[PDB]
Design a protein around this ligand. Structure first.
Ligand code: FES
Ligand code: FES
Ligand code: FES
Ligand code: FE2
Ligand code: FE2
Ligand code: FE2
Lengths: 389, 389, 389
């Protein structure tokens, strides 16, 4: 709420909520790390939707606390002091909080303080699934994780493996680039195309009407909200790039057909199937860290019926898929996102851009996101609720 | 237009336009590089008056395009793709533009797009003269280059050689320092003074009336607009610096008389004649890159009637004039400009400064610039014209 | 005056002046360096309360001038030119000022200028005491230095030795941390505690009423204004830190009793006695450099009746006290101050903090500072008085 000039928001009637969501959507689940990255009793710090958070594993279970002492507002993480398995003590004046509910249960510097038991640090639900750590950055009872994940991510036999890193661009530029039908042009020279014998057009010549370009999903049984890119159902793929009629570039004529099923879902996760191989799928999140950065959380899934298959997949992922696809293919997406930063930095790119046909997919997403998000994160949420107002 | 607090502009009645021109004057020709720095088919990027530009040489002729794709606003230069001699293709979605007129002539990702032939990237006139590349950062048909150059710069026999670099100061601080009669004090220890046996006073004791201190030229046949520094016509040069009557510093008593003809011209180019030698002239521009930086475009001219003379001059320029004068003399001007940055950074130096007599020259320039500039560059010009307003 | 959002100042009714004093209090004496750091004829530059200053020693006496030429606002210090013992000449156009009164007495570039003798650079009183250089950053005749120093700092036999450095935090965060009764918890592992066999509790269990927690001194004969921390008179020290009743940390049970007398005084100097040893005292200033930094001026005092005692103290200070206490003990105070920067950066920490009992000392200081400061430094003071208004 109110993150962008009200004059700008008025000019984007329809996508106002999305354009105002510079810090991301509150009240959604977001992956922030892999389960294997956090061990028992070893607290980790991270920033999500602009909020500094602390995560710890106690008796195998994950807990999340706001990394900001209620007293003088310092980050508890400057010098972590976990003196009992169930608590964390601020290094400054020893205000001690329970990981389970955030309650201020003791103050070592004054065990008679009237504040004891009468204050509580903000906590957020945390859930592990498919080896991924999800945090519900929101208030009140959380919805099922399934609502904020793409279809078949949570399938029992679906084996998930991935990589995560911090990228310097607003999360929305990442989402749009990912769901951009014509951006495929930047991947024309990817080592994955050659090395994995992929069929890859340079673009698409749209066919049919506007509504036919996508499929807005707002009737999913588990509550998922997203959009499918159907530009290929009535459109013809472009394999010959011409300038003045002269062919100056050709697409890839490989045998492997992939990415014929592309969808984007709130809070901002893309599903590409099948990819990077006809028997795999890719699920990637663009998680808001702050207005200028996001976690590029990549995962590749492949059905596995037994430990043997999971073991081999893990080996192929490490030796091939990770370096050839997640990096060899998606690395170009990273600098593409970065290249849009300047134009959208002053919030004016949203009104000065000149879109064309294939962008219908992006427009569909901006509308769905505007209408189905569960809340707009604001600086007020970040700085906290005032006292004495 | 509107680059400075309106309260400030009101307090500088008269020089308001000049004080507001933080980004420079639009609709003027500006040198940005030397001809030898750009070869056939090798695009170059640069920022002029805050605008990112692309320049290319095609069939020997120079062309200039706005380095910002109309689609998503990325710089085409992130990954240059010139697929035909007459065009450039954006690396993102392949929108293709003609260098000649900026028209969007093709889109490789969708050759059926309705945008083709219906959009046009901004272009700017470019002209080469005396081995220097000039760009007309303005709209509509450009005036003769002569209007924006000092007298005798374009003389047929005038051989021009120079150096260019980026300096961290607003362009106006550079102009004023260059046209500052008393700033000569900072050059008192220049190696050029000794090594070239120059006569150089520490300052001047003004004589005559105010109007006699300068000569405002606004009746030049080719349209040039500038001011001559005539402080030496009625004033007496100061060769003995005294404090409490005691001589603490003396000027230079060399035989070579130079810089007795000094003039500043819009858009911001200084002419010093003769200098650094009695048979040479210096023409230097202070080109606006953005509000905090400028190109310090230095050139030294010397009449040459034949290839033999031009060849020797080139040799002397490289072995002597460039290192002894352009660098040995003008290097002090660079940190002097930088030293004024802080005081003028908040736009208040324009009203808090305390000028004295010799500054009449600077005041004359601020008035001429305010009255004869061809337009004030604004952030609106930089960010571009909005859509849907 | 007006350094903070008026909405914020209204919410802190009472401490408004203190909260608005981001740049420090004008019209107070502040130490900025040690006498031994500035020699005869060797000018030094520094920034105090946001103002760039120049200090010089002439015939053994210190003088302070504003490091900003009246002409074009450059710092004279870019290239110091002291051509006569009593003056300094700006490197740009040679406007020459007297160190004694700041008067513009000559201009080498124009000895006939009408400005000569009619302009004056700002000067500030400077006084040396106990080997420390104090500057009265204020206007008009200065009060006795004693008014702005803690009791017994100026005692004849009191031998003062110290260290100074620049710290990245607003000065107020430094003052509050220093006068914070419960912050002692951060010093629990200091090498000084063990190596000097100190008795050091983890905190305090307050006793008595609110007014009994401190002693506000506003009736001192020399005008000093400060507050004593009396939390230990009715309170019981905490040596056993418990969580859920379980002892998880203990204080230090050393024999040496110290810091039983703690007081903070305007403009911002703390006195701890006895410390770091039962026969010594510590006086430390948190001097405003700009809104984000301060000088952490530490001094340790010890009575000495003869040169022999002073000589031995100096030796002990260098080999023990300086590295074990000033650094070994106070280094933790440095990062503690830095840890509060973020929460108070937007000026909202003053209203969002949640204090508890021992903070009564800090509240008492914020009230005293608000009521007895001699002026609020503003950006207006820094940028200077306008011309032509
Ligand atoms: S800031 Fe955490 S206990 Fe004081
Ligand atoms: S941003 Fe250039 S073609 Fe899309
Ligand atoms: S700026 Fe100092 S004499 Fe001109
Ligand atoms: Fe991509
Ligand atoms: Fe110069
Ligand atoms: Fe401390």
């Amino acid at each position: 709420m109110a993150n962008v000039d009200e004059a700008i928001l008025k000019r984007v009637k329809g996508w106002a909520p999305y354009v105002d969501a510079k810090l991301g959507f509150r009240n959604h689940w977001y992956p922030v790390m892999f389960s294997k990255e956090i061990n028992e009793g070893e607290p980790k710090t991270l920033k999500l939707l602009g909020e500094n958070l602390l995560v710890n594993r106690i008796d195998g279970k994950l807990y999340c606390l706001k990394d900001r002492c209620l007293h003088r507002g310092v980050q508890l993480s400057v010098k972590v002091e976990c003196k009992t398995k169930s608590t964390i003590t601020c290094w400054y004046h020893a205000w001690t909080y329970r990981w389970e509910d955030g309650v201020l249960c003791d103050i070592l510097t004054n065990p008679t303080s009237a504040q004891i038991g009468r204050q509580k640090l903000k906590t957020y639900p945390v859930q592990e699934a498919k080896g991924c750590v999800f945090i519900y950055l929101g208030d009140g009872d959380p919805p099922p994780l399934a609502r904020d994940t793409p279809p078949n991510f949570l399938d029992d036999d679906m084996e998930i493996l991935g990589k995560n890193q911090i990228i310097k661009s607003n999360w929305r530029l990442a989402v749009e680039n990912g769901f951009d039908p014509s951006h495929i042009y930047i991947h024309k020279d990817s080592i994955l195309v050659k090395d994995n014998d992929l069929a890859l057009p340079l673009g698409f010549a749209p066919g049919g009407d506007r509504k036919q370009q996508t499929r807005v999903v707002d009737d999913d049984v588990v509550g998922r909200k997203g959009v499918y890119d159907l530009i290929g159902e009535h459109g013809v793929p472009v394999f010959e790039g011409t300038i003045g009629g002269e062919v100056v570039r050709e697409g890839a004529y490989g045998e492997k057909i992939v990415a014929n099923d592309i969808s984007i879902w709130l809070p901002g996760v893309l599903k590409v199937n099948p990819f990077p191989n006809p028997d795999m799928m890719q699920f990637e999140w663009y998680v808001p860290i702050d207005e200028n950065t996001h976690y590029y959380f990549q995962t590749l899934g492949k059905p596995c019926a037994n430990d043997e298959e999971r073991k081999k997949y893990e080996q192929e992922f490490e030796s091939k898929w990770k370096p050839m696809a997640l990096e060899g293919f998606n690395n170009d997406d990273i600098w593409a996102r970065e290249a849009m930063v300047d134009f959208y930095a002053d919030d004016k790119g949203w009104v000065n851009e000149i879109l064309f046909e294939s962008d219908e997919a992006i427009v569909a997403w901006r509308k769905l996101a505007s209408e189905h998000n569960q809340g707009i994160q604001t600086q007020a949420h970040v700085s906290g609720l005032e006292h004495h107002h």
